[PDB]
């Protein structure tokens, strides 16, 4: 049941939620398509569970620091762009075109991650390092992680990731590394 | 009827994503019978194609035509992106990411197409005399604007009240505009 969610998030990452069928998620942890119906009613309720798992793998991953100094920011960032399953940021950003049936309860996900984020973003801020006031630090924070989202997707896509994620790093920490004491 | 159809084929494919629409939802959108619409396309992704080029062509036209280069410029610049780009075409945009392989390469040269034009346009703005950071920290900063606007305009769009999104983003953006010029 978790082999079938994970393989699912990962068949609705490349084939979208319409374009993934049962037979694909069946055939894909070989069981039978009658099995589903136990568990589940229906494909949406594969892709609900799959969006939850989601969004638990970014909570987890954002609140995950095995330092909050400035070294360990970068070292936020770092791990944020490199680190991160390129299947969950495509799950995330295909969340724009899912069934309107469940806009309640990922808008109730996305206002939990948006907190969890403002929260965990904070502790990094430290005036003595930054010269920045602390809303402008965390909306700048938030334009890095959002806009990598984009960039991930886009070049997993059409180019290549490996050298996106070197390049992506490298402009983040250069205008961050402006306001760095 | 081509432009009709291509107008209404926009609104669908970025509400509902491609595989989620139909040629039944299209010539339902625009009144007429199927038969019209093979008449002018051959097939779904012919009209997803023109969609995207038609999308292509709205972006590139709005950066190419105020001409007014000024810093003061620039602010206005980032005001009728966020405030007057049509939210269709920023979530088609953004859906480009699950686009249908056979437009991969199509897709992929149109887009080195508009880094091109938006980085020649974005540089005009750049003038050392009034700008204190590096010109590529600078591109890339307007670039972050851009690019975090495409990702949450496509979820307040879906998820939210888009005109609270507009504001909300515009004042963070003309905050650290400020902080950083």
């Known amino acids: 049941k978790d082999k079938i969610i994970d393989n ?36 949406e309720e594969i892709y609900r569970k799959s969006v939850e798992n989601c969004f638990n793998y970014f909570i987890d991953f954002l609140l995950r620091n095995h330092n909050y100094s400035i070294d360990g920011l970068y070292q936020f960032l770092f ?16 969340l724009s075109s899912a069934p309107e049936a469940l806009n309640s309860e990922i808008k109730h996900h996305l206002q939990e991650i948006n907190t969890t984020l403002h929260d965990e973003l904070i502790k ?3 005036p003595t390092h930054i010269a920045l006031d602390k809303e402008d630090f965390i909306n700048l924070i938030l334009l890095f992680l959002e806009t990598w989202y984009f960039r991930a997707s886009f070049s997993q896509k059409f180019g290549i990731i490996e050298d996106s ?12 590394n402006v306001f760095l004491k």
Do not use: M, P
């Open 8 to 43: 699912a998030i990962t068949l609705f990452s490349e084939k979208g939620y319409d374009g993934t069928t049962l037979d694909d998620i069946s055939k894909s942890v070989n069981i039978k398509k009658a099995s589903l119906y136990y568990h589940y009613d229906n494909k």
């Open 79 to 94: 791990k944020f762009i490199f680190d991160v399953d390129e299947r969950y940021i495509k799950l995330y950003v295909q």
């Open 124 to 126: 990094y801020y430290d």
């Open 165 to 176: 994620k070197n390049r992506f790093k490298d402009q983040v920490y250069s205008l961050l």
